[PDB]
Amino acid sequence: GEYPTVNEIPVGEVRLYQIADGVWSHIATQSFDGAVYPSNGLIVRDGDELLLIDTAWGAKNTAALLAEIEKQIGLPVTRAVSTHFHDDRVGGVDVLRAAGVATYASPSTRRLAEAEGNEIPTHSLEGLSSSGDAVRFGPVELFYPGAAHSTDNLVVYVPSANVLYGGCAVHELSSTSAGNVADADLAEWPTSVERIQKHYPEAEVVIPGHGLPGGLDLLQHTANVVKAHKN
Ligand SMILES: C[C@@H](c1cccc2c(-c3ccc(CS(C)(=O)=O)c(F)c3)c(C(=O)O)[nH]c12)N1CC(CCN)OC1=O
Ligand SMILES: [Zn+2]
Ligand SMILES: [Zn+2]
Hints:
The protein is α/β, with parallel strands linked by helices. About 25% of the residues lie in helices and about 30% in strands.
């Protein structure tokens, strides 16, 4: 019943967690540079179909994700959006594409994925290139807050449930640093978080890219840990 962690998640297995009516997160674990990390994504019911946000960080994890969705939900995943270019967001796009899923990301994410040798979503999401931009995509709104964890990071809001999926631009409350900052803009990140706070003041659940969901406090906590990481 509690939100799952690695200690319940061997690498290769996937858990789903019901967030709200028609909204689940997915949780998987992966090894990277000799350490094991959890990571989240989102699943949103879209009538008789499902919209997937982010892969489960790897090909085998993403295959396991599709199997877990069939077991627990039983509706087809028809579209997926990746919220930035890192492997915890696009690793598994090839699996999705061979399982009938149409894969999408911004042009900025597609270019960065291609340049870095990561898997590349098929379709480009226009209308998101300026900070503060928002577009509708099925049952969600996609929002580009500005550079934060990465220059391309997108945020996803589920208006029916007031669920804010921050992706890796948002950290969990227990975080002690800003995570993997390799491609981050620590100077711009607080401004981007402030844009999220201003745009989604009615969010009830906030889901970070890694770790435990909570409420709006995750946004302020993220700004706090990023400002202190920078300093
Ligand atoms: C594949 C991805 C990656 C791999 C491994 C770990 C992470 C973390 C991470 C780290 C620590 C914490 C605990 S905490 C908030 O207290 O510090 C955390 F929650 C998340 C993140 C993230 O923060 O989103 N991304 C990671 N990658 C790869 C990459 C550059 C490759 N050239 O950059 C990146 O992010
Ligand atoms: Zn990342
Ligand atoms: Zn991440």
